[PDB]
Amino acid sequence: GSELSERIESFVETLKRGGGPRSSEEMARETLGLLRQIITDHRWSNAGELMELIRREGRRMTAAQPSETTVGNMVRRVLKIIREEYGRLHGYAQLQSNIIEAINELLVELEGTMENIAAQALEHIHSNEVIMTIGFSRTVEAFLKEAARKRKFHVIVAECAPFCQGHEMAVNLSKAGIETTVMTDAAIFAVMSRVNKVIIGTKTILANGALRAVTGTHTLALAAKHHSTPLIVCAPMFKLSPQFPNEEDSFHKFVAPEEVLPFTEGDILEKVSVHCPVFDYVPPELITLFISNIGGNAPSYIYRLMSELYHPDDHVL
Amino acid sequence: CRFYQHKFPEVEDVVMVNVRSIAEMGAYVSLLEYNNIEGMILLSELSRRRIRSINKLIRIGRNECVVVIRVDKEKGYIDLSKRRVSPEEAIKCEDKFTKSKTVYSILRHVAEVLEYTKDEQLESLFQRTAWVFDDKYKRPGYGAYDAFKHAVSDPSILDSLDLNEDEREVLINNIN
Amino acid sequence: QVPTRKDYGSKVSLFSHLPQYSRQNSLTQFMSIPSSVIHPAMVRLGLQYSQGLVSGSNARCIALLRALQQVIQDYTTPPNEELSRDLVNKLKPYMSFLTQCRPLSASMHNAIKFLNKEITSVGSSKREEEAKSELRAAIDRYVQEKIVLAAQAISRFAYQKISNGDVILVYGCSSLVSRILQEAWTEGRRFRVVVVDSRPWLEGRHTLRSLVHAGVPASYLLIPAASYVLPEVSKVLLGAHALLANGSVMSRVGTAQLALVARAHNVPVLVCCETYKFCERVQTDAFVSNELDDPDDLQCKRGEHVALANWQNHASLRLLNLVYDVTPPELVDLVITELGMIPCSSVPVVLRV
Amino acid sequence: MDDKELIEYFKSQMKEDPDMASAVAAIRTLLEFLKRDKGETIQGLRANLTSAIETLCGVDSSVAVSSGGELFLRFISLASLEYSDYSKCKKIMIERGELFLRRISLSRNKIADLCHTFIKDGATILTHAYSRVVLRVLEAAVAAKKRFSVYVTESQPDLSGKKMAKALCHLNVPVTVVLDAAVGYIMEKADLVIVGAEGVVENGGIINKIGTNQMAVCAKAQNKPFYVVAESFKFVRLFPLNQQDVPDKFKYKEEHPWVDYTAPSLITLLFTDLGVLTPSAVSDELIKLYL
């Protein structure tokens, strides 16, 4: 049963350094897989022992890299599943089978997420209109080049100044022939007048409806609230996590300060500290629409799902 | 219009009551089969699900039969229960309700034809006559029951009250 | 298949998706007047929709519903086909013909969708007479606890709000509102009422009458003059044609405007909208669900040289009379419904389950 | 058994315990009455408790006590009463009542170790009154060995802030008693404002002592995030829209309110033993819980 432990390591490591896997929903999938293995390579006197074990493991997971809590909420929902099963079917052993199907169920639903969102797109964006996006958020490449087969419009993609992370989407939408444009984040307020409804990615959905986003997003949402054009969060619901913003501000992945001011610059690096947060906050009171697996949703709406998805008694995990 | 020789019904009496007003601890149920007996009713488990339910104002008046679990006279109420009931007893209470309605129209036509402007006196005469006609059959207010049983050929039992021939006239007329 | 409503108007660019039909090019010109392929009661309803005879939201609802009441009660099934399928079928092209003669709001959408869910939720065992009768009775319970009970409940609930002396704003033909206002005034509480109305379909006169003929001191003025009465009105009291996913409200061409200005002068915003209205889609924007009506019913009277009679006759001209706008939940304070006096941004949850 | 001993018993309970917020003292005395009701009925006891709660409301002008009465009335008939004798009912009923007592006692500790992790270290906390719950949650956050200051207002009509200081500095925390009218001044220099509440309205905002709202409004314009604490029972089914609307059974005890309301547009994060909230969630939770 140590092969389980070695796969656990393999992940925990690939997690604990940097981009891996470079896709988010992928991370979710490998997560669920490893969880399934934890179950199918273990037994329990009572399901409480399995709850305990998966809680320990999820603690290691989220504590390792609290910047990406996706897997945090995956183990949360798995705790929900076992909670629900021991609730129903004892309110004893064969229910292991039960558990497994749930995973598959969850799993298979996950496999449709992207395409689900696709169906919404063809509704919102009426043609020849201007949409703004910050990043290469796969869900949004899906969104747009899946609503660019019946209409035509204009998407301007900003650029997270740390990376070129807001250029790959430009080259992709070029490969999809939509006549999109590139720009430098500092100029978003420059053109925020001529936007219609910003379509932004997201990286988590706190239980306050406050999304932690790829950096250079707080300014986008603030410019939006100013011009009062609406915010289109392309957040599949698995990206939730029942964190409520204020704890300890282990909050923004502080990536290699090499990014902003590269090391080539002489001695000035002796009294010049550096900051480079790749993930910023956006207050929920600016959100408009949680385009999601179940269609339109508003800020408050989100805790409803946090009511149902993750059993509240385990946000301390 | 009083109720019967049982002006204060006893236990196991399943009154046909309506819901006068939805409430918090339990819907205040009121009936006339005991001359406006009013009490509560223990809100059920799936009736604790009446939060998101529709229009607590709708379904106010649509009467139904309920059993009387507790009882009180000076405390002035009755705790009616619904979840633990049967529809055969519902049909029996429907029969008793038809009898009640018959007796109510009877008292109305008494007040009209016999000009009984008085309420307590006329209602007590009627209730005594009904108890007389009833205690031989012992059914729930069997007075009018025997009245319509014998009124096919012999409703002359009204001789005891030789005060208004319009009484038996309207009886044998509105009957058939 | 069906005769097609002929698109009328130099459709503006930003609203091409939704159609600009009208009421002069009647749809019944082509149809085989023997109402066989198209049921007679449904088609009479469809027509008196095109002519815009029935306007009130829940009014249009009850209209459609009693029309399908007649349809069912006179409907018969083909030989050897289960009703809960061919009925759904027969309804489908009738709904289509409806959307042709007059686009269908979310109200009648919820209506027809519920009726389909009911039709299908009963199987083969349905005896024809008893099947049609049970559908009658279910349609009844539906209309009862959704539009002639929800109304009285909304009113019996909101009545506690309206204090004395506080003049109240209203927007037009929202029958529900008029019922609330009357059933309030008749309880001792006192107030004036200001009414607001907008072109082209000048309408508040419906509510204006239904008020004054119940003895409430009233006042009435077009919508751009809103700012003149807002420093006095203490509570606005809108209507609503639908409740959407995010939590917004939709209503006639105006109501968003009044919501906005009345937020500006800090006067609390009411909305009154009974549950079954509540749809499930979302609309953050205000341009992707709006049932554009005719252009040439827009104009007014100037001497006699009505400035637009030559409508298409120019080159560039492109008119429009948007019908529904949407107040985001950022303004609407309190949505009274029979379920409670819930706050706006908390609607979709408590009405979903 | 009569209403005299009920009111004086509430008085005695609050006197032997100023540390027990009026609501819980009321509910306690209410259970006490339920014990020695010496009745044998179901509804005939509902009438008794309703009348008694009316009296208590007519004695103490707080929203807390009447609201707790409503909620107790709810939480004696929550599921199937299992109506069997109209007497054993009373037994199981008062059992659920003492359980209600349990949760109401737990409320504070629950909300404290729910919140005391919300105070970033080295910032100025600006309370508003002798909010027992605020004092407790602070006391907690201190016990976790943090650093932060305290600005307290003084809520003019009665000296509240003076009392809160006199009892907080007993914990040796940096304390500074502004003059409540000066809130607009120190509002520049404190980051976030914890404020005690005395009743939550069904759309998310809170109702609280005289100055709350204006403080609230200041602490929104400058984007300074705005907190609030209130345990379960102080939810209320009162939905004003204007500060004039709040019922006048609360507003008294020349003409000057004692409590007033803040729109939920402003309140940025609740605190309820039910958990962290989001004012619309207070609505949803109220419609659900109240029953």
From Swiss-Prot, chain A:
What residue ranges are annotated as transmembrane?
none
Q: Which family does it belong to?
A: Belongs to the eIF-2B alpha/beta/delta subunits family.
- Activity regulation info: Activated by the chemical integrated stress response (ISR) inhibitor ISRIB which stimulates guanine nucleotide exchange factor activity for both phosphorylated and unphosphorylated eIF2.
Assembly information from the UniProt record: Component of the translation initiation factor 2B (eIF2B) complex which is a heterodecamer of two sets of five different subunits: alpha, beta, gamma, delta and epsilon. Subunits alpha, beta and delta comprise a regulatory subcomplex and subunits epsilon and gamma comprise a catalytic subcomplex. Within the complex, the hexameric regulatory complex resides at the center, with the two heterodimeric catalytic subcomplexes bound on opposite sides.
Give any single GO term for biological process: response to peptide hormone
As for subcellular location, the record says: Cytoplasm, Cytosol
**Organism whose genome encodes this protein:** Homo sapiens (Human)
Protein name according to UniProt: Translation initiation factor eIF2B subunit beta
Q: Which UniProt keywords apply?
A: Cytoplasm, Disease variant, Initiation factor, Leukodystrophy, Protein biosynthesis
Q: Name one GO cellular component term.
A: eukaryotic translation initiation factor 2B complex
Q: Name one GO molecular function term.
A: GTP binding
| Gene3D superfamilies referenced in this protein's UniProt entry, alphabetically | Translation initiation factor eif-2b, domain 2
- Which Pfam families would you find in this protein's record? IF-2B
Curated annotation (Swiss-Prot), chain B:
Chief location of this protein within or outside the cell = cytoplasm
Question: Where can this protein be found?
Answer: Cytoplasm, Stress granule; Cytoplasm, Cytosol; Mitochondrion
Instruction: Summarize what the UniProt record says about post-translational modification.
Output: Phosphorylation at Ser-44 and Ser-47 stabilizes the eIF-2/GDP/eIF2B complex and prevents GDP/GTP exchange reaction, thus impairing the recycling of eIF-2 between successive rounds of initiation and leading to global inhibition of translation, while concomitantly initiating the preferential translation of integrated stress response (ISR)-specific mRNAs. Substrate for at least 4 kinases: EIF2AK1/HRI, EIF2AK2/PKR, EIF2AK3/PERK and EIF2AK4/GCN2. Phosphorylation on Ser-47 by the EIF2AK4/GCN2 protein kinase occurs in response to amino acid starvation and UV irradiation. (Microbial infection) Phosphorylation by vaccinia virus protein E3 and rotavirus A stabilizes the eIF-2/GDP/eIF2B complex and prevents GDP/GTP exchange reaction, thus impairing the recycling of eIF-2 between successive rounds of initiation and leading to global inhibition of translation.
Its Gene Ontology molecular function terms?
Answer: ribosome binding; RNA binding; translation initiation factor activity
Q: What is its induction?
A: Up-regulated upon endoplasmic reticulum stress.
- Positions modified as N6-acetyllysine? 136
Q: Where is the signal peptide?
A: none
Where is the PTM Phosphoserine found along the chain?
44, 47, 153
Q: Name one GO cellular component term.
A: extracellular exosome
Keywords (alphabetical) are: Acetylation, Cytoplasm, Initiation factor, Mitochondrion, Phosphoprotein, Protein biosynthesis, RNA-binding, Translation regulation
Where does the record place the S1 motif domain?
12-83
| Gene this chain is encoded by | EIF2S1
List the range of the whole protein covered here: 6 to 181 of 315
UniProtKB/Swiss-Prot annotation, chain C:
Q: Name the linked condition.
A: Leukoencephalopathy with vanishing white matter 4: An autosomal recessive brain disease characterized by neurological features including progressive cerebellar ataxia, spasticity, and cognitive deficits. Brain imaging shows abnormal white matter that vanishes over time and is replaced by cerebrospinal fluid. Disease severity ranges from fatal infantile forms to adult forms without neurological deterioration. The disease is progressive with, in most individuals, additional episodes of rapid deterioration following febrile infections or minor head trauma.
**Keyword hit for Cytoplasm:** yes
GO (cellular component) term, any one: cytosol
This chain's protein is named: Translation initiation factor eIF2B subunit delta
Q: Which organism is it from?
A: Homo sapiens
- Cellular location(s): Cytoplasm, Cytosol
Q: According to the record, which residues of the full protein are present here?
A: 166 to 518 of 523
According to the record, the residues making up region (May bind the chemical integrated stress response (ISR) inhibitor ISRIB) are 5-14
| A GO term for molecular function | guanyl-nucleotide exchange factor activity
Q: Anything known on activity regulation?
A: Activated by the chemical integrated stress response (ISR) inhibitor ISRIB which stimulates guanine nucleotide exchange factor activity for both phosphorylated and unphosphorylated eIF2.
Query: Which keywords describe this protein according to UniProt?
Result: Acetylation, Cytoplasm, Disease variant, Initiation factor, Leukodystrophy, Phosphoprotein, Protein biosynthesis
Entry keyword Amino-acid biosynthesis: no
Chief localisation class: cytoplasm
Give the UniProt family note: Belongs to the eIF-2B alpha/beta/delta subunits family.
* One of the GO BP terms on file: response to heat
Curated annotation (Swiss-Prot), chain D:
Q: Which GO terms describe its molecular function?
A: guanyl-nucleotide exchange factor activity; identical protein binding; translation initiation factor activity
Domain of life from the UniProt record: Eukaryota
Q: How is its activity regulated?
A: Activated by the chemical integrated stress response (ISR) inhibitor ISRIB which stimulates guanine nucleotide exchange factor activity for both phosphorylated and unphosphorylated eIF2.
GO cellular component terms, semicolon-separated = cytoplasm; cytosol; eukaryotic translation initiation factor 2B complex; membrane; plasma membrane
Q: Where in the cell is it found?
A: Cytoplasm, Cytosol
SUPFAM superfamilies assigned: NagB/RpiA/CoA transferase-like
In the record, which positions carry N6-acetyllysine? Answer: 35
GO terms of biological process kind? cytoplasmic translational initiation; oligodendrocyte development; response to glucose; response to heat; response to peptide hormone; T cell receptor signaling pathway; translational initiation
Q: Of which family is this protein a member? A: Belongs to the eIF-2B alpha/beta/delta subunits family.
User: What role does it play?
Assistant: Acts as a component of the translation initiation factor 2B (eIF2B) complex, which catalyzes the exchange of GDP for GTP on eukaryotic initiation factor 2 (eIF2) gamma subunit. Its guanine nucleotide exchange factor activity is repressed when bound to eIF2 complex phosphorylated on the alpha subunit, thereby limiting the amount of methionyl-initiator methionine tRNA available to the ribosome and consequently global translation is repressed.
- The name of this protein is Translation initiation factor eIF2B subunit alpha
Question: Lineage in the entry?
Answer: Eukaryota, Metazoa, Chordata, Craniata, Vertebrata
